[PDB]
Design a binder for these strands. Structure first.
Ligand SMILES: CN[C@@H]1[C@H](O)[C@H](NC)[C@H]2O[C@@]3(O)C(=O)C[C@@H](C)O[C@H]3O[C@@H]2[C@H]1O
Ligand SMILES: [K+]
Ligand SMILES: [K+]
Ligand SMILES: [K+]
Ligand SMILES: [K+]
Ligand SMILES: [K+]
Ligand SMILES: [K+]
Ligand SMILES: [Mg+2]
Ligand SMILES: [Mg+2]
Ligand SMILES: [Mg+2]
Ligand SMILES: [Mg+2]
Ligand SMILES: [Mg+2]
Ligand SMILES: [Mg+2]
Ligand SMILES: [Mg+2]
Ligand SMILES: [Mg+2]
Ligand SMILES: [Mg+2]
Ligand SMILES: [Mg+2]
Ligand SMILES: [Mg+2]
Lengths: 163, 80, 131, 200, 134, 87
RNA sequence: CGCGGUGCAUUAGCUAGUUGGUGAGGUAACGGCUCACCAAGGCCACGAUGCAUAGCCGACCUGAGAGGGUGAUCGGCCACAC
RNA sequence: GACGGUAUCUAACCAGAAAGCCACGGCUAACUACGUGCCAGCAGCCGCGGUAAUACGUAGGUGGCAAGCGUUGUCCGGAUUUAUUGGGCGUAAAGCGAGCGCAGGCGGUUUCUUAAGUCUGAUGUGAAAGCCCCCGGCUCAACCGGGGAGGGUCAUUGGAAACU
């Protein structure tokens, strides 16, 4: 669990979808907002909020994202290693990139990585392009990422021995 | 002195006098998938005395053209 | 019928790790022993032992789980398969997760990890990836 | 081709001061055109990256094709950040060298001097504003041209010069003592966004 | 599939087809055959000139011409812009390009080339519609 | 016959030449047997780089230098060396 | 002479100097290269044969790569000269 | 010395002779006025036009590029949309109605041996030119030149023996 408080978080509205519920009198339109909140130093989360108005949807999404923070391990300005995160139609492959190469990512993956604070990384979405699913796949891959020190501790070796 | 190519193969036809048909039976990798695929290359070899019989492992050395299709000379009958 | 006993061993380990079993047992073989000892010394598995029977022997593996019962072995993948053998030259030796994993390889110097293979500057057949 | 249109409108389209003074953004600090003063929706990420690329290429007065080629050259450099290296090459552009030496008030003036041949590199006339200046080369005003009010006023007025440029006012001779640094250059530009833009 | 399956029956990719077939085939009078030559445009004679009805979503009188090309293929081409001087037996140049409204129109008539006259009064996008700078 | 001759290279109005050994029938810039040196006339003292061992070997084998290549070899002293070898 | 680089099986049989042998002649030269006899052999689902298309390559364009596409200029080889 | 009084250099005069093209509904950077009224027309796809159109025409502004700009034609990519790298087949396309079986593909453990595959070293070659890496020459660049590297399921030869 990552406590949202004590972290200076910023919010990015990845996508606002107009969702319709059909009713006897016609259609009840609502807005579902997907928001990514991040510290740009290794903590990021995403949230969904539904409301009749865009501001309220965004607010609820921001609260959800705050409650759903996770930590992303990061070596230098990039991720420790390559990883594929899969969730539903979402399937995102992410690779470490050389220093200064930029965020070679697209769509919501860009928002997720930028808000997480990764500055150089390559990525490709091999699955669906639905924003919620791609964001979920991205966070799954980030949670799959591992730390060299933790790997060494688990394997009972020194980091030099591992490498 | 330069060396001519020598092949180990199996006789598959001796019904011609003073000659035999031999098969090399090599393996090659598929260009796309990399699996080893069987490949049967067969040559016509000149037999001096029709010693070799069908289904015999033999050695042949390439020579100058001896006929329309002959390009090899029998050396040994490794097995019968 | 069983055509890839090595892949079968890897899958047994994978399933046992998935359900967090303490130990597993497999029919023995030289290559399986080599893989087991490589994992043992790389710290992926807690322990290995052998039992002599009248068929081929049995190899028992004691898995390793960290604090909070976190799985040390994330996964295993069979690279060289009977359907398609995989060979790598010395330069082509793969690095698993930038070295955080390992690639078990069989070479003329024996069965060794990718680190050892590239230290010796020799290729071979990539038996498996572990991480 | 060379751009000869207004400077203030370009700078306020970019949202930064190309002259480095803010004289252009002092009044009406927003994009030109009848739709400037009234607000507008958010700019997309593609728009942000385009804005950064335009910031750089308008800062250095370069056409897009040459910008692309120089960017690829910068990429070729194995060591260091790609964006930083691209910035350094932009600086090493001869026009920028003259401007930093202060022989001209504005980069347009420096480029015109270079093009008309009032500058000499290591004592030899060079009319190529695109010329790439290596560290240690001496940039001096052509002896015949040294007596012109424009450059005299520029030299006397210029009070601050970058730490990486050494200059002698009496000889009108300057040079770079080393490569410029990221901080030493325009910090208000995000080279990473340009890198991603050309990554496309 | 298995690796052996792929070895036996390798992958085969779909063959694409040109969206403007008539431009891809030339004609040789001597052999009286059609040659396979890619051409950015092709010359043809307007066998018929008239108007056509769009599909259901749209209502208009789209201006069209039935043209026999130099390769002896007869096609139907749109007439972009407002107003035209075309008549049957008028030599025109045809470029690729589909028209969503029209079912069987796959080519456009290049304005300002051959008998096609530039669109009078045009002042924007003049390169299209083929009018000189006023 | 085998000629040690000049194969033109460079750009328009900026010639450069490679001294190469080639069959006389082969085109000027076409097929050649072996490169032996270079020749840059645009330099006031004409610049020349020569593989004198190869040049001498080909001269012994019977290659016939063209006029300009003969001038170059004379200036470089290779021709004198070959004359002494014949002696 | 080994190997490599097109599609079609809604193209399955093809071959009769053809396959090999003994002679003879011929060639700068081996050789059914040609001829006379002797036998019936040879190729083929590892695609013979036939059909359509095509000069081949160093190279060029694209792609992260694997690959895909092309075979102008320049150089190599081959073929052609109503 | 054809090029040729050509490159180039010097001196004097004048901002004076030397900027268009496409786009601005989303994709996609760029917005308002009128004219028009499912007509005229636009359009790569979604789709615009039915009397208050940022989607048609025009004008003013704006964005992109620039002695170029846009359209068409064609190849690669995006396309994991033939998936070896790198997809699938209960309901989306996709398990033959089922079996017996030749060839073929694959195949249990283990001792020794071989070295076809596999890995590794040397030699020869894979022309030149071209990509790429250094270094020079054209005022820079393109371009040119010097030196390397690379490029083979290559041929001979020496090794290793875990796996096939
Ligand atoms: C019988 N009176 C009806 C009945 O109460 C309906 N509820 C089942 C009610 O439903 C509404 O409230 C709705 O939400 C739907 C609308 C069409 O009519 C509205 O008024 C509807 C009322 O007129
Ligand atoms: K004969
Ligand atoms: K002929
Ligand atoms: K539009
Ligand atoms: K596959
Ligand atoms: K079934
Ligand atoms: K072996
Ligand atoms: Mg939820
Ligand atoms: Mg230009
Ligand atoms: Mg001279
Ligand atoms: Mg032809
Ligand atoms: Mg691709
Ligand atoms: Mg926009
Ligand atoms: Mg238009
Ligand atoms: Mg309009
Ligand atoms: Mg593809
Ligand atoms: Mg159905
Ligand atoms: Mg179905």
């Amino acid at each position: 669990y990552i406590d949202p408080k004590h972290l200076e978080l910023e919010d990015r509205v990845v996508a606002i979808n107009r969702v319709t519920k059909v009713v006897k009198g016609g259609r009840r339109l609502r807005f579902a907002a997907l928001v990514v909140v991040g510290d740009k130093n290794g903590h990021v989360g995403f949230g969904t909020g539904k409301a009749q108005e865009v501001p309220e949807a965004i607010r609820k999404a921001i609260e959800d994202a705050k409650k759903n923070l996770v930590e992303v391990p990061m070596v230098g300005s990039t991720i420790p290693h390559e990883v594929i995160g899969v969730f539903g139609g979402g399937r995102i492959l992410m690779k470490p990139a050389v220093e200064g190469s930029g965020v070679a990512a697209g769509g919501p993956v860009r928002a997720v990585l930028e808000l997480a604070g990764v500055a150089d990384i390559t990525s490709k979405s091999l699955g669906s392009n639905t924003p919620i699913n791609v964001v979920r796949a991205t966070v799954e891959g980030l949670k799959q990422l591992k730390r060299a020190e933790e790997v060494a501790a688990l394997r009972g070796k020194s980091v030099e021995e591992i490498i | 002195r330069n060396q001519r190519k020598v092949y180990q193969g199996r006789v598959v036809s001796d019904k011609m006098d003073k000659t035999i048909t031999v098969v090399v039976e090599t393996k090659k990798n598929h260009p796309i998938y990399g699996k080893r695929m069987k490949y049967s290359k067969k040559y016509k070899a000149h037999d001096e005395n029709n010693t070799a019989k069908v289904g015999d492992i033999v050695k042949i050395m390439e020579t100058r053209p001896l006929s329309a299709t002959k390009r090899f000379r029998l050396l040994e009958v490794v097995e019968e | 019928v069983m055509t890839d006993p090595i892949a079968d061993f890897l899958t047994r380990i994978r399933n046992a790790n998935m359900v967090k079993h303490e130990t597993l047992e497999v029919p023995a073989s030289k290559i399986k022993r080599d893989i087991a000892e490589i994992l043992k010394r790389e710290g992926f598995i807690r322990d290995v032992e052998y039992i002599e029977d009248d068929k081929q022997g049995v190899i028992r593996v004691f898995l390793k789980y960290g604090k909070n019962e976190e799985r040390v072995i994330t996964n295993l993948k069979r690279i060289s398969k009977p359907g398609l053998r995989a060979y790598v030259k010395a330069d082509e030796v793969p690095k698993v997760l930038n070295g955080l994993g390992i690639a078990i390889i069989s070479t003329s110097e024996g069965v060794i990890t990718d680190k050892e293979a590239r230290a010796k500057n020799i290729g071979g057949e990539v038996i498996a990836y572990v991480w | 081709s060379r751009y000869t249109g207004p400077s203030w409108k370009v700078s306020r389209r970019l949202g930064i001061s190309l002259s480095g003074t803010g004289k252009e953004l002092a009044r009406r600090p927003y994009k030109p055109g009848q739709h400037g003063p009234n607000s507008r929706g958010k700019v997309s990420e593609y728009g942000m990256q385009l804005t950064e690329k335009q910031k750089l290429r308008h800062m250095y007065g370069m056409n897009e094709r040459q910008f692309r080629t120089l960017f690829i050259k910068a990429s070729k450099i194995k060591e260091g950040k790609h964006g930083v290296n691209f910035m350094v090459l932009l600086e090493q552009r001869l026009d920028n060298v003259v401007y930093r030496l202060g022989l001209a008030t504005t980069r347009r003036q420096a480029r015109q001097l270079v093009n008309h041949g009032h500058i000499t590199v290591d004592g030899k006339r060079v009319d190529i504003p695109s010329y790439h200046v290596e560290v240690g080369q001496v940039i001096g005003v052509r002896e015949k041209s040294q007596n012109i009010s424009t450059i005299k006023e520029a030299v006397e007025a210029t009070v601050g010069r970058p730490a990486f440029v050494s200059f002698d006012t009496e000889k009108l001779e300057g040079s770079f003592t080393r490569l410029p640094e990221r901080d030493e250059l325009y910090p208000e530009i995000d080279e990473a966004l340009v890198v991603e833009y050309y990554n496309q | 599939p298995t690796i052996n399956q792929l070895v036996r029956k390798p992958r085969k990719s779909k063959v694409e087809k040109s969206d403007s077939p008539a431009l891809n085939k030339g004609y040789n009078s001597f052999k009286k055959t059609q040659t396979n030559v890619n051409s950015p445009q092709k010359r043809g004679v307007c066998t018929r000139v008239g108007t056509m009805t769009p599909k259901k979503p749209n209502s208009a009188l789209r201006k069209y011409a039935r043209v026999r090309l130099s390769n002896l293929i007869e096609v139907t081409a749109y007439i972009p812009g407002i107003g035209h001087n075309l008549q049957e037996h008028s030599v025109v140049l045809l470029r690729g390009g589909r028209v969503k409204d029209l079912p069987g129109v796959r080519y456009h008539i290049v304005r300002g080339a051959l008998d096609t006259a530039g669109v009078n009064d045009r002042k924007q996008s003049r390169s299209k519609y083929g009018t000189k700078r006023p | 016959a085998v000629k040690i001759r000049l194969k033109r290279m460079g750009s328009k109005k900026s010639p450069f030449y490679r001294i190469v050994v080639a069959d006389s029938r082969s085109p000027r810039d076409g097929r050649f047997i072996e490169t032996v040196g270079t020749y840059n006339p645009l330099k006031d003292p004409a610049e020349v780089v020569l593989k004198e061992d190869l040049v001498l070997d080909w001269l012994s084998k019977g290659a016939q230098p063209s006029d300009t290549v003969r001038n170059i070899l004379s200036k470089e002293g290779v021709m004198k060396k070959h004359h002494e070898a014949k002696n």
